[PDB]
Amino acid sequence: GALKKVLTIAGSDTSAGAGMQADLKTFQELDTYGMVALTAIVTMDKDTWSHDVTPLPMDVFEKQLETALSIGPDAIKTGMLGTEEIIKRAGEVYEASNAQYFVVDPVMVCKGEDEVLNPGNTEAMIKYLLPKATVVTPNLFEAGQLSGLGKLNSIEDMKKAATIIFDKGAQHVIIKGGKALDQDKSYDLYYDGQTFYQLTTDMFQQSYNHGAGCTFAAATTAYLANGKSPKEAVISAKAFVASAIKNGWKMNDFVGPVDHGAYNRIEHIDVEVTEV
Amino acid sequence: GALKKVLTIAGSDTSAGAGMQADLKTFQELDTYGMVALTAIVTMDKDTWSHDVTPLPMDVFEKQLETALSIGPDAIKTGMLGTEEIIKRAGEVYEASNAQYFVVDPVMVCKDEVLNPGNTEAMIKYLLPKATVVTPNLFEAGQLSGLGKLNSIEDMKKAATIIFDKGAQHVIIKGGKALDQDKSYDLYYDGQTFYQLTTDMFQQSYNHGAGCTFAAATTAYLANGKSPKEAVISAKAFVASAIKNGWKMNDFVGPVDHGAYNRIEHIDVEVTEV
Numbered sequence: 001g002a003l004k005k006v007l008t009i010a011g012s013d014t015s016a017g018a019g020m021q022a023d024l025k026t027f028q029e030l031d032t033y034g035m036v037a038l039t040a041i042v043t044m045d046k047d048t049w050s051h052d053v054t055p056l057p058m059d060v061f062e063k064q065l066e067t068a069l070s071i072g073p074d075a076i077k078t079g080m081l082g083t084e085e086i087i088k089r090a091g092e093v094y095e096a097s098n099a100q101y102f103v104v105d106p107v108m109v110c111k112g113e114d115e116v117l118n119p120g121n122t123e124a125m126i127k128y129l130l131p132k133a134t135v136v137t138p139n140l141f142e143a144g145q146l147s148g149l150g151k152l153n154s155i156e157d158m159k160k161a162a163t164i165i166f167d168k169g170a171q172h173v174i175i176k177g178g179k180a181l182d183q184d185k186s187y188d189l190y191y192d193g194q195t196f197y198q199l200t201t202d203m204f205q206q207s208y209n210h211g212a213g214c215t216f217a218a219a220t221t222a223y224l225a226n227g228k229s230p231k232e233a234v235i236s237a238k239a240f241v242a243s244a245i246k247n248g249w250k251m252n253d254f255v256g257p258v259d260h261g262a263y264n265r266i267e268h269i270d271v272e273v274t275e276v
Numbered sequence: 277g278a279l280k281k282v283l284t285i286a287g288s289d290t291s292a293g294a295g296m297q298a299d300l301k302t303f304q305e306l307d308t309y310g311m312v313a314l315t316a317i318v319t320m321d322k323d324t325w326s327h328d329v330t331p332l333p334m335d336v337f338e339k340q341l342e343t344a345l346s347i348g349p350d351a352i353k354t355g356m357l358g359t360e361e362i363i364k365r366a367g368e369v370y371e372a373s374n375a376q377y378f379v380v381d382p383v384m385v386c387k388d389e390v391l392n393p394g395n396t397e398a399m400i401k402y403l404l405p406k407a408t409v410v411t412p413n414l415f416e417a418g419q420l421s422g423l424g425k426l427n428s429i430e431d432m433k434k435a436a437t438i439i440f441d442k443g444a445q446h447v448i449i450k451g452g453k454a455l456d457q458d459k460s461y462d463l464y465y466d467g468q469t470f471y472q473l474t475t476d477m478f479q480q481s482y483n484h485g486a487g488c489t490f491a492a493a494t495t496a497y498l499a500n501g502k503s504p505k506e507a508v509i510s511a512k513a514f515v516a517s518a519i520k521n522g523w524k525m526n527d528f529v530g531p532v533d534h535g536a537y538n539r540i541e542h543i544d545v546e547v548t549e550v
């Protein structure tokens with residue numbers, strides 16, 4: 001049958017490792033028809049790599065959503081969304097569409113590493129996106145914010161956060177451990193409301209991992225669209241991103257992206273799956 | 277070795293078949309590191325499919341170029357560029373970069389007339405003399421050459437000569453549906469020899485993004501080390517498969533399948549000196 005239509009709602013990462021660029025790249029690697037409704041353009045200073053976020057006007061955001069809704073996505077992913085207004089609209093486009101899958105990557109920006117910048121966006125994601133999400137994909141910080149637990153440091157903490165987030169309406173929860181968990185291996189925790197699954201790969205180099213989160217969530221969405229269950233989709237996504245990470249490369253002294261095409265071009269990576 | 281970094285200077289096609297979307301998708305298919313400096317956003321009315329083109333401000337355009345230049349592209353493609361100002365800056369950024377390859381897709385909208393011939397003039401002045409490859413369709417080639425309507429391979433040879441002499445190192449004029457409908461003929465010229473490139477003419481219903489995809493593939497193939505002639509032949513094969521495997525999105529548009537070459541099938545290109 002036809003390619004599945006997969007929409008991301010996200011900003012442009014000019015460096016092209018994260019943002020909508022990671023999304024579209026990943027959708028393409030996974031044999032789906034990628035689409036984007038652009039929210040903002042992120043650029044980087046040539047000397048410091050300091051970010052500058054330029055919002056797109058709401059009129060143009062809405063016109064893009066109108067076109068995408070008309071086309072009719074089979075699955076929708078949200079990336080980093082910067083305002084309450086866009087968060088609310090993203091949930092509404094999903095609800096208006098005939099998409100069967102909604103993957104929410106609840107991206108938050110930090111003022112420390114234990115302090116959120118812009119707590120209002122967290123409340124808006126809880127209010128508008130969690131109750132709609134097929135899969136929500138917080139990192140360890142984000143999971144602590146969504147759950148209200150604060151700092152999480154263990155699989156047991158992640159289980160508690162997943163329970164809470166599920167109870168807030170997300171159908172499936174994957175709490176990424178990854179670098180933030182800082183163990184010998186890379187652990188994530190998947191929950192479906194009944195069983196907790198720990199997903200494990202090797203922990204690869206950490207220097208060039210830009211776009212890992214976006215890519216994981218994008219892969220999850222494409223795998224869902226192509227007919228994997230949420231559990232299978234997150235397992236497959238972890239393999240996909242792990243290869244991308246292993247094969248990350250140095251862009252400059254400030255960043256290096258994952259290699260989105262590594263899973264297909266270079267190597268598959270094994271994922272261990274255990275009940276916890 | 278490292279992925280080649282390939283930048284497109286292009287707008288967003290919200291429908292995702294053409295524009296920067298086709299470019300990034302094609303770059304990815306061809307095992308390069310795709311990047312975009314966005315010039316504009318094109319949206320379509322849900323009921324009539326009427327297009328609205330929203331230019332992006334020059335300040336955000338410049339911020340993107342600074343980032344992309346810092347990264348350091350190995351190859352740059354230009355897509356549909358809306359203003360003489362942008363056309364000029366695109367050539368400048370190529371020269372400022374260490375990129376070895378510049379692929380200019382001289383996209384025009386036919387309104388033997390364009391909306392603003394000043395854009396054609398700016399392409400001639402600022403882009404053609406920097407281009408490794410320029411990739412006009414039959415209409416665009418008439419405009420760039422000053423010949424108007426082209427009807428034949430012979431006309432295409434004249435237009436290719438004129439465009440080459442305006443300073444493009446290599447010229448491929450796409451005939452496609454405009455020229456004939458039993459086969460899809462293109463004319464490649466390197467200043468020395470004229471080559472006709474041929475595939476079968478495939479379905480014509482769902483061909484959205486074909487031109488962008490062709491120029492994007494040319495760019496990636498040059499970045500990955502194919503000569504200009506081999507790059508354009510490979511690009512024609514790549515897009516031929518994408519066209520053959522095109523599909524209906526809605527009543528208004530049917531995109532090419534950018535991944536068809538690698539996932540579905542290759543298509544051989546017949547090459548003959550003419």
Ligand SMILES: Nc1ncnc2c1ncn2[C@@H]1O[C@H](COP(=O)(O)OP(=O)(O)O)[C@@H](O)[C@H]1O
Nearest residue numbers: 139176178179186202203204205206212213216
């Ligand atoms: N260096 C690494 N090696 C292996 N897996 C990793 C690594 N970094 C992250 N991951 C995995 O990549 C995915 C994305 O992780 P995420 O936590 O979103 O990235 P970040 O560290 O930016 O927050 C998760 O599946 C996570 O386990």
Ligand SMILES: Nc1ncnc2c1ncn2[C@@H]1O[C@H](COP(=O)(O)OP(=O)(O)O)[C@@H](O)[C@H]1O
Nearest residue numbers: 413450452460476477478479480486487490512
């Ligand atoms: N229906 C078709 N069958 C086979 N090849 C085609 C078809 N339509 C276009 N082509 C080829 O696709 C490429 C892009 O052509 P074209 O669509 O003329 O560019 P443009 O969109 O800029 O008009 C060329 O190599 C052309 O020969």
